[PDB]
Amino acid sequence: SMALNEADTCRVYVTPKLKESGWENNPSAITEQYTFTDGRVQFKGSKVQRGEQKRADYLLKYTRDFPIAVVEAKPENSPVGQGMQQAKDYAEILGLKFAYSTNGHEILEFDYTTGEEQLLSRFPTPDELFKRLCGDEGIKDEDLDTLLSPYHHVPRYYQQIAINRAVQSVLQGKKRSLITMATGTGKTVVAFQISWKLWSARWNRTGDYRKPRILFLADTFTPFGDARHKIEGVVKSREIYFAIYQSIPGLYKEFPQDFFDLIIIDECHWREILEYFEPAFQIGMTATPLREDNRDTYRYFGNPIYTYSLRQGIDDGFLAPYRVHRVISEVDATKDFERVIALKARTDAFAKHLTDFMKRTDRFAKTIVFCVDQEHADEMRRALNNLNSDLSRKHPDYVARVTSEEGKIGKGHLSRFQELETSTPVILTTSQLLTTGVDAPTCKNVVLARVVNSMSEFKQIVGRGTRLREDYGKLWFNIIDYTGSATQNFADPDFDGYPEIEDEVVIDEDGEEVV
């Protein structure tokens, strides 16, 4: 009754002690109740909502764009060692090296740089921690201004982890680093801020005053303008270059080996450009973790400096959760070339089953169906069209095929499909092109009607629907599996977590379920 609230002890003891230690003297700052998550999309009864919303009592920032420690406060009447594991957990999630648990009068510190846990007579100062941070990480005084080089503002907690560890890696002389981030989490935001940090800071391989030369390769940057140059159709006067593999025969040899100071790759899973461009620092980004088809990537770039999984994204409310509906044909209640035989021979069963499914759920939910080949995609499109001819007669482009064969007409359909405000096409059929070809956030159904031959491909397919758009009613999605194995074969709880719902249904040769 004389005892102080958790809130009361932060006001009376914690905050004052933090200020006394200089955490409010510019550029350092204190941000109480640091909320850095959006809340896991959950379900309750037949209804959906976000629960979660991760928050730390205090976040201690050395600089505005440079967080460095975290604090777990508790009421004065409770023991300090209580909030230690909770504080350590936030440190680990936010990528920090210093964690504190306090009850107002006592302060318990866990220092990741020494592994020592101890009571302090007071909070360390911004300078003390940053000196500890640079010492353990080995960053010379000359590189302090690059390490603290400001972001370009007006990035989420994990993007910052990625960005800082990359910049840190480069400053330590690691000429080859890897970053794994689930598709749709901001790999480009990270790519851009690393470039900006090092560029504006005048960082480079030789260490003079020149701006660095950076090549971004793939297959937001306006702030750079005129330093910018796309390699099309050569120019050795710009500073920030972009290039698609198709454009870079062997053009790059016109640039010398030591032209670039840094090269950033959109997706690592060509080696001649990289092995040609040594000793340029190289940062590789990939969307899939080390698995069976993936090894050479992790061998060339080494182990990731940071990994942001699908599992973490869903838990943070940044990626969408999913339901799996495995559909197996009755005849089965091992091969590979017969696999595709059966798949193409059942095109009408799948189309009937998908149509009934959509009729009982949402006939206008944007859907993508991954077929065996372009020929399969066209037959799938025609079948699905005729099964929904009541809608076809109102919307001629209800179903559409997006394949290489469909050229410019194909691109048109894809373009409209991707738009948030358009109602059709509703269904796009493809084979390979849309595995990494589509960026459609309102996609609500991801359909498998093909032999997936790799883990990377599987995750790319599944990543077609993980994007969130609460804005447009997009909170979760379905993965309808007609292969009767893909979702079991490529199951990956470590990177993907488990699905909210997962069921299997048996279907006859006409696509009617049986029991």
Q: Helices 157-171 and 187-200 meet at what angle, rounded to 10?
A: 40
Q: Which helix (H) or strand (E) holds 507?
A: strand 501-507
Which residues neighbour 46 within 8 Å (Cβ) at sequence distance 6 or greater? none
C-beta of residue 186 within 8 angstroms of C-beta of residue 319: no
Residues listed for the chain? 515
Greatest pairwise CA separation for the chain in angstroms: 79
β pairing state of 281-286 and 176-181? parallel
- What is residue 122's DSSP assignment? S
With beta carbons less than 8 A apart as the criterion, state whether 460 and 291 touch: no
Q: Is the peptide bond before 321 cis (omega within 30 degrees of 0)?
A: no
At 230, is the secondary structure helix, strand, or coil? strand
CA distances (Å), origin 395, targets 307, 368, 420, 422, 423: 43, 17, 17, 12, 9
What Rg value do the Cα atoms of the chain yield, rounded? Answer: 26
- Two structure tokens written together for 444: 């609500």
Nearest CA to 72 out of 90, 60, 57 is that of 57
Task: Please give the C-alpha separations between residue 25 and each of 149, 495, 514, in angstroms, as whole numbers.
Answer: 19, 40, 70
CA 386 to CA 393: how far, in whole Å?
Answer: 10
d(CA 267, CA 217): 8
If one counts every other C-beta atom within 10 angstroms of the C-beta of residue 233, the result is 6
Full strand arrangement of the beta sheet holding 214-218: 228-230, 240-244, 214-218, 262-265, 281-286, 176-181, 306-308
Beta bridge partners of 98: 69, 111
Residue 16's φ and ψ, nearest 5 degrees, are -60, -45
Domains of the chain: 1-137 (3.90.1570.30), 138-307 (3.40.50.300), 308-514 (3.40.50.300)
Whether the CB-CB separation of 62 and 129 falls below 8 Å is answered with yes
Which distant-in-sequence residues (6+ apart) come within 8 Å of 488 by Cβ?
A: 326
Beta 240-244 vs 214-218: how paired, if at all?
A: parallel
**Contact in structure between 483 and 449 (CB atoms under 8 Å):** yes
- 514, with CB counted inside 10 A (0-12, 13-18, 19+), is exposed
Q: How far apart are CA 114 and CA 87, in angstroms?
A: 16
CA dist 389 and 479 (Å) reads: 24
Burial (CB < 10 A; 0-12, 13-18, 19+), residue 156, is middle
Which of 79, 56, 86 minimizes the C-alpha distance to 68? 56
Q: Where would I find the H helices in 370-454? A: 374-387, 389-392, 407-418
CA distance 417 to 426: 7
| Distance between CA atoms of residues 57 and 5, nearest Å | 14
Sole residue written with tokens 């800082």? 164
Tokens of residue 445, six digits: 């159904």
Please, after which residues is the chain broken with C–N above 2.5 Å? 154, 219, 233, 248, 269, 333
User: Please, what is the Cα angle at 460 between 458 and 464, to 5 degrees?
Assistant: 115
Q: Give the resolution to one decimal, in Å.
A: 2.3
Identify the CA nearest to 94 among candidates 38, 137, 37.
37
Give me the sign of the Cα torsion angle 252, 258, 260, 265.
Answer: positive
Helical (H) or strand (E) element with 161:
helix 157-171
Report how far residue 341's alpha carbon sits from residue 276's, in angstroms, rounded to the nearest whole number.
43
Helices (H) and strands (E) in the chain, counts: 18, 23
Report phi then psi at 217, rounded to 5.
Answer: -120, 130
CB contact at 8 A, 405 and 431: no
Phi, psi of 513 (to 5 degrees): -75, 155
Cβ pair 81, 74 in contact under 8 A: no
Three-state DSSP state, 198: helix
Using CB atoms within 10 Å of the CB of residue 503, give its burial: 0 to 12 exposed, 13 to 18 middle, 19+ buried: exposed
Phi and psi at 481, nearest 5°, equal -105, 110
Could you tell me the CA-to-CA distances from 236 to 82, 216, 239, 314 in Å, in that order?
Answer: 59, 15, 8, 43
For the record, the structure tokens of 230 come out as 């796309």
Q: Are 414 and 428 in contact (CB under 8 A)?
A: yes
503/480 Cα distance (integer angstroms): 10
Residue 474 gets which letter from DSSP? B
Contact indicator for 180, 287 with CB cutoff of 8 Å: yes
Side-chain-side CA neighbours of residue 284 (13 Å): 24
27 phi and psi angles, rounded to 5 deg: -80, -5
Phi, psi (deg, nearest 5) at residue 478: -110, 145
Q: What are the beta bridge partners of residue 241?
A: 215, 229
Buried b (16+ CB within 10 A) or exposed e, 120-145: eeebbebeebbebbbeeeebeeebee
Phi and psi torsions of 204, nearest 5°: -175, 165
The label of the residue with tokens 């193409």 reads 344
Q: How far apart are CA 459 and CA 80, in angstroms?
A: 43
Residue 472 is classified by DSSP as: G
- The residues facing 285 across adjacent strands are 179
C-alpha–C-alpha distance, residues 294 and 421, integer Å: 37
Beta-bridge partners for 486: none
Q: How many CA atoms lie within 13 A of 278 on its CB side?
A: 8
Task: Judge contact between 98 and 68, C-beta under 8 A.
Answer: yes
Coil, helix or strand for 304? coil
- The secondary structure of residue 215, as a DSSP letter, is E
* 442's tokens: 């309102």
The number of angstroms, rounded, from the C-alpha of 319 to the middle of its chain's C-alpha atoms is: 8
First to last CA, the chain: 64
The whole-angstrom separation of Cα 7 and Cα 245 is 56
Contact 329, 346 (CB under 8 A): yes
